[PDB]
C-alpha cells in the first residue's frame, strides 16, 4: 500500500504552473483598465435612448464582457498581495 505510492512518487516528473508568479502584476493592471472601460461604457448607455429593446441588448452584452474580465482581474490581483 505504501510501496506502490512510494515507487509511483519517484517515477513521476515535476509540476509546471500555468502562469508564473512574477508575471501576474502585469496582467493585473492590464486587466483593471479594460474592465473599467467596458463596464463604464456599459453603465453609460442606461440613459434616455427611449428604445427599450436595443438598450437591454447593448447593456446585457457589455455587462457580460465586463463581468468576464472582472473575474480574471480579481484573481490575478489577489495573488500579488499575499493572499492566495
Amino acid at each position: 500500500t505504501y510501496e506502490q505510492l512510494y515507487k509511483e512518487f519517484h517515477s513521476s516528473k515535476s509540476f509546471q504552473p500555468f502562469i508564473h508568479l512574477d508575471t501576474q502584476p502585469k496582467f493585473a493592471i492590464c486587466g483593471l483598465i479594460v474592465t473599467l472601460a467596458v463596464l463604464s461604457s456599459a453603465l453609460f448607455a442606461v440613459g434616455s435612448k427611449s428604445s427599450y429593446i436595443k438598450k437591454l441588448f447593448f447593456y446585457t452584452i457589455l455587462s457580460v464582457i465586463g463581468s468576464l474580465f472582472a473575474g480574471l482581474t480579481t484573481v490575478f490581483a489577489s495573488n500579488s498581495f499575499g493572499v492566495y
Partner: protein, 52 residues
C-alpha cells in the same frame, strides 16, 4: 506520543483535479458581478413618480 528526530517520515495523498474545475473560480466571481449589474438595471428603469 511521537518524538522529534526518530519519527519524521512523509505522508502520501493521491488525488485528481480536472481541467473543468480549474476554471470555475473566475466564473464564480464573474457570475456574482453579472447578477449584481442586473439589479441596478431593473432598479434604475422603473417608474416611481407620483405625479402624472
Amino acid at each position: 506520543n511521537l518524538i522529534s528526530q526518530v519519527a519524521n517520515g512523509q505522508v502520501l495523498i493521491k488525488y485528481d483535479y480536472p481541467k473543468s474545475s480549474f476554471f470555475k473560480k473566475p466564473l464564480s466571481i464573474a457570475c456574482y458581478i453579472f447578477t449584481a449589474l442586473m439589479g441596478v438595471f431593473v432598479l434604475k428603469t422603473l417608474n416611481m413618480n407620483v405625479t402624472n
